[PDB]
Design a protein around this ligand. Structure first.
Ligand SMILES: Cc1nc2c(N3CCCC3)cc(Cl)nn2c1C
Ligand SMILES: [Mg+2]
Ligand SMILES: [Zn+2]
Length: 313
């Protein structure tokens, strides 16, 4: 009951910042996450014994893939923590509870392949879920782990609070399907620019939580350049594997996923920052002003990719 998780001084300080890297010590990530829940939500949102057993089951159900791994899960959860801490009063007791869990769980049991690859390979998951294939599977894995004995961290909620939190987590996880991001952001642009945007409108909150999830999910583009650059390796290692598997199915993969076209990476980062990242953190900063650091870091790293092309690194 009186057991405050504390971190070494540098982490204690650095963790509050958007650009925090959680480090190479796997065995500290669970304590980083519990620390984040306690400061975000309260020391009493969750029975500690249930929380810990949930975290270790979630961890076990992430695979040893180069990017879509347990490190990713905790990285996206920490970005959500930074957003929630710099916007204290805008979110309910339940949204704070559900969104960190949503982020930790958001890529559960990912195999390192796009929804696109499942559809062309004709994976059973693509017959069970026609759109947002992996994302419906991720949510489905969350519920499975929540129903393991001694793993219901939401046990103390009412019947209707429990249903509310599982619906926050479902929409939060579906929103990480980047196919849905584009429309979601355009609608948020329009609504904020005409003044229609209203945070008491539940369907408007949903869109804003949706955009936060894209932002946290893409947060590797908002790090110090050496972190961004080294994560890009892990990211491309999956794409090139998936490209290999597309070729095995007798299909030329998009150049992004083609490991013969490594030369084109810097320009592909350009495309991505201009088409996806900058628009994402631009619209997010308009809706949620204290998140500007994400936009500024994203801009700084775009500038760093421009420099790679110009042969200045
Ligand atoms: C975080 C991040 N995500 C991507 C990404 N995708 C998002 C998921 C599907 C495509 C594409 C590219 Cl080219 N870079 N990139 C980065 C840096
Ligand atoms: Mg995903
Ligand atoms: Zn993700």
């Amino acid at each position: 009951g009186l057991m405050q998780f504390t971190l070494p001084v540098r982490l204690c300080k650095e963790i509050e910042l958007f650009h925090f890297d959680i480090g190479p010590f796997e065995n500290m990530w669970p304590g980083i996450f519990v620390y984040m829940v306690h400061r975000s939500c309260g020391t009493s949102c969750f029975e500690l014994e249930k929380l810990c057993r949930f975290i270790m089951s979630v961890k076990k159900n992430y695979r040893r893939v180069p990017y879509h791994n347990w490190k990713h899960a905790v990285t996206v959860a920490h970005c959500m923590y930074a957003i929630l801490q710099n916007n204290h009063t805008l979110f309910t007791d339940l949204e704070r509870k559900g969104l960190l869990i949503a982020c930790l769980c958001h890529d559960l049991d990912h195999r390192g392949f796009s929804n696109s690859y499942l559809q062309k390979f004709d994976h059973p998951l693509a017959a069970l879920y026609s759109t947002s294939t992996m994302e419906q599977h991720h949510f489905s894995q969350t519920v499975s782990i929540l129903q393991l004995e001694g793993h219901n961290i939401f046990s103390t909620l009412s019947s209707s609070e429990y249903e509310q939190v599982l619906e926050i987590i479902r929409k939060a996880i579906i929103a990480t399907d980047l196919a849905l991001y584009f429309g979601n952001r355009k609608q948020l642009e329009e609504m904020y620019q005409t003044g229609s945007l209203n945070l008491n409108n539940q369907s408007h909150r949903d869109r804003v939580i949706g955009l936060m999830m894209t932002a946290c999910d893409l947060c590797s583009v908002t790090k110090l350049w050496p972190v961004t650059k080294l994560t890009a390796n892990d990211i491309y290692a999956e794409f090139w594997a998936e490209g290999d598997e597309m070729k095995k199915l007798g299909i030329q993969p998009i150049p992004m996923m083609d490991r013969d076209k490594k030369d084109e990476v810097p320009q592909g980062q350009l495309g991505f920052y201009n088409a996806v990242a900058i628009p994402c953190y631009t619209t997010l900063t308009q809706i949620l002003p204290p998140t500007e650091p994400l936009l500024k870091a994203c801009r700084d790293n775009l500038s760093q990719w421009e420099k790679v092309i110009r042969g200045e690194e």
